[PDB]
Design an enzyme around this catalytic site. Structure first.
Site, mmCIF file in Angstrom:
data_model
loop_
_atom_site.group_PDB
_atom_site.id
_atom_site.type_symbol
_atom_site.label_atom_id
_atom_site.label_comp_id
_atom_site.label_asym_id
_atom_site.label_seq_id
_atom_site.Cartn_x
_atom_site.Cartn_y
_atom_site.Cartn_z
ATOM 1 N N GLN A 142 -2.640 5.128 -15.515
ATOM 2 C CA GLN A 142 -2.334 4.149 -16.553
ATOM 3 C C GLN A 142 -3.453 3.127 -16.716
ATOM 4 O O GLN A 142 -3.770 2.721 -17.840
ATOM 5 C CB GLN A 142 -1.005 3.454 -16.248
ATOM 6 N N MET B 108 -14.215 5.256 -0.517
ATOM 7 C CA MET B 108 -13.351 5.454 0.644
ATOM 8 C C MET B 108 -13.009 6.943 0.643
ATOM 9 O O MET B 108 -12.104 7.380 -0.076
ATOM 10 C CB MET B 108 -12.111 4.621 0.381
ATOM 11 C CG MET B 108 -12.236 3.103 0.560
ATOM 12 S SD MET B 108 -12.946 2.519 2.100
ATOM 13 C CE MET B 108 -11.399 2.420 2.983
ATOM 14 N N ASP C 129 0.842 -7.300 -3.891
ATOM 15 C CA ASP C 129 1.404 -5.950 -3.995
ATOM 16 C C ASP C 129 1.012 -5.085 -2.794
ATOM 17 O O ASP C 129 0.480 -3.984 -2.940
ATOM 18 C CB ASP C 129 1.067 -5.307 -5.342
ATOM 19 C CG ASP C 129 1.858 -4.022 -5.613
ATOM 20 O OD1 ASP C 129 2.854 -3.717 -4.911
ATOM 21 O OD2 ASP C 129 1.476 -3.315 -6.578
ATOM 22 N N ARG D 161 0.382 2.598 -0.900
ATOM 23 C CA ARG D 161 -0.312 3.102 -2.083
ATOM 24 C C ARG D 161 -1.500 2.244 -2.474
ATOM 25 O O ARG D 161 -2.353 2.715 -3.235
ATOM 26 C CB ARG D 161 0.646 3.193 -3.260
ATOM 27 C CG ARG D 161 1.189 1.826 -3.646
ATOM 28 C CD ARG D 161 2.128 1.897 -4.858
ATOM 29 N NE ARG D 161 2.683 0.565 -5.083
ATOM 30 C CZ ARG D 161 3.697 0.075 -4.381
ATOM 31 N NH1 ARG D 161 4.388 0.834 -3.546
ATOM 32 N NH2 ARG D 161 4.013 -1.212 -4.505
ATOM 33 N N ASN D 162 -1.577 0.996 -1.973
ATOM 34 C CA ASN D 162 -2.692 0.096 -2.237
ATOM 35 C C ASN D 162 -3.602 -0.075 -1.024
ATOM 36 O O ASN D 162 -4.270 -1.096 -0.883
ATOM 37 C CB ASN D 162 -2.187 -1.250 -2.754
ATOM 38 C CG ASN D 162 -1.640 -1.142 -4.160
ATOM 39 O OD1 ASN D 162 -2.110 -0.304 -4.947
ATOM 40 N ND2 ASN D 162 -0.642 -1.967 -4.494
ATOM 41 N N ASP E 200 -7.228 -3.444 -3.937
ATOM 42 C CA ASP E 200 -6.590 -4.022 -5.125
ATOM 43 C C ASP E 200 -5.891 -5.339 -4.810
ATOM 44 O O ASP E 200 -4.857 -5.661 -5.401
ATOM 45 C CB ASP E 200 -5.621 -3.035 -5.791
ATOM 46 C CG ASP E 200 -6.332 -1.842 -6.441
ATOM 47 O OD1 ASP E 200 -7.575 -1.834 -6.543
ATOM 48 O OD2 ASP E 200 -5.624 -0.897 -6.843
#
Ligand SMILES: CN(c1ncnc2[nH]ccc12)[C@@H]1CCCN(C(=O)CNc2cc(Cl)cc(Cl)c2)C1
Length: 267
Positions: free
Chosen positions: A20, A85, A129, A133-134, A147
């Site tokens: 997205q 990474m 957040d 996943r981050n 992030d």
């Protein structure tokens, strides 16, 4: 400016993903240095606000934070240039059962994240957040936090508030879900959930529940329970992140001390 990278210095080599927010590519800067190049989809971010914040983000240097190298803002789409990474997203890495992780490895991942978060805490910078996943994993298996603070600049309405479909309900303390009260202690709560994700090898937290059911569960004072791979001491650390009263939750400095103590006990 010091935050601005010349896009002519980039060589694009491989696609790392599309979603997205845009397209991520692996490339080289000035022929030599590995970078990830994030090509931002128009309309997905508040770009001028992000660029201003990028100046602060670039001064956040810690070995366990994914480094922001700069931005390319003179063309459309803008680019955000970060550390590369090689092992990708932590959530996918945890879900690859072939690694056959030892619990000492899982605790080391928790320590990597905790060190990054203690550094951000020392700088009064919230992640906002934090979740598997981050986080990202390098070629040596080191986990780094990615992030950080990005959610402040995402325009997608489904992600912005507790009511949205993309909001990280399962990583959020009761005071965030009920009142939108973000603080160091909401990062603490999310960290405890991340510890749970690590020791559960990437299971979805509250896997049998919807987001609405999870929020009700948490509001009633109920919690995740112990992953099979977590020792009693490890579970105590993650559980301490989930006190209903935010002021009773530890700091990242305390969590780091706790994690280092358990590392010594369990080696
Ligand atoms: C495969 N991969 C990596 N693989 C190796 N080295 C990397 N360095 C940085 C990312 C990375 C990431 C896995 C998670 C998803 N992802 C993102 O970058 C997510 N965040 C984001 C933020 C913005 Cl503002 C724009 C856009 Cl398009 C994406 C790619």
């Amino acid at each position: 400016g010091s935050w601005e990278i010349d896009p002519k210095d980039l060589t694009f080599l491989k696609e790392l993903g599309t979603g997205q927010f845009g397209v991520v590519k692996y490339g080289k800067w000035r022929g030599q240095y590995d970078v990830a190049i994030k090509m931002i989809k128009e309309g997905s971010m508040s770009e001028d606000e992000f660029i201003e914040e990028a100046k602060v983000m670039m001064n956040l240097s810690h070995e366990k934070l994914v480094q922001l190298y700069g931005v390319c803002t003179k063309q459309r789409p803008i680019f955000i240039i970060t550390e590369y990474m090689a092992n990708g997203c932590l959530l996918n890495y945890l879900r690859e059962m072939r690694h056959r992780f030892q619990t000492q490895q899982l605790l080391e991942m928790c320590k990597d994240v905790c060190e990054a978060m203690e550094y951000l805490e020392s700088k009064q910078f919230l992640h906002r957040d934090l979740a598997a996943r981050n986080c990202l994993v390098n070629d040596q298996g080191v986990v780094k936090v990615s992030d950080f603070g990005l959610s402040r600049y995402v325009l997608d309405d489904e992600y912005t508030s507790s009511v949205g479909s993309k909001f990280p309900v399962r990583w959020s303390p009761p005071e965030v879900l009920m009142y939108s009260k973000f603080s160091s202690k909401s990062d603490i709560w999310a960290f405890g959930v991340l510890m749970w994700e690590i020791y559960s090898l990437g299971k979805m937290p509250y896997e049998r529940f919807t987001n609405s059911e999870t929020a009700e569960h948490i509001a009633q004072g109920l919690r995740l329970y112990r992953p099979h791979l977590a020792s009693e001491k490890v579970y105590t650390i993650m559980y301490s992140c989930w006190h209903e009263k935010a002021d009773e939750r530890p700091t990242f400095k305390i969590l780091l001390s706790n994690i280092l103590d358990v590392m010594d006990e369990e080696s």
